[PDB]
Ligand binder design. Structure first.
Ligand code: GN1
Ligand code: CA
Ligand code: CA
Length: 117
């Protein structure tokens, strides 16, 4: 099961992984990391973070061009919800808090894995 918005479904099994291991888990499940593209999608992800009591990865990262956060397509963000002062070792990946706000993090951080389908 999971939380859905339109045709998109977010799911978690409570796994906690680094960014690379999280990406591999979602891809092997034939999805991808949570990529909220709207307020409504962000709120669905946030509900799951609050339930699990653990910040989650989003898919987006700036590994290609520093400060330009992109999806796995390489396209620039169409929506963001940065915490105050964010984006503030390098922090190339993105976590979502239980208040729904985002923070850039080192990609070695171990976070909740939420996939989208
Ligand atoms: C690993 C991690 O999440 N670090 C966070 C965290 O860093 P500090 O070590 O607590 O200053 O809070 C910062 C905001 O004050 C945030 O920008 C940063 O990404
Ligand atoms: Ca960065
Ligand atoms: Ca940060």
């Amino acid at each position: 099961d999971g939380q859905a918005v339109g045709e998109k479904i977010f799911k978690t099994a409570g796994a906690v992984k680094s960014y690379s291991d999280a990406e591999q888990l979602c891809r092997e499940a034939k999805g991808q990391l949570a990529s909220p593209r709207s307020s409504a999608e962000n709120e669905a992800v946030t509900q799951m973070v609050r339930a699990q009591e653990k910040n989650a990865y989003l898919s987006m990262n700036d590994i290609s061009t520093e400060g330009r956060f992109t999806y796995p397509t390489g396209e620039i963000l169409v929506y963001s919800n940065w915490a105050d002062g964010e984006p503030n070792q390098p922090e190339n990946c993105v976590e979502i808090f239980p208040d729904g706000k985002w923070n850039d993090v080192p990609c070695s951080k171990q976070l909740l894995v939420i996939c989208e389908f």
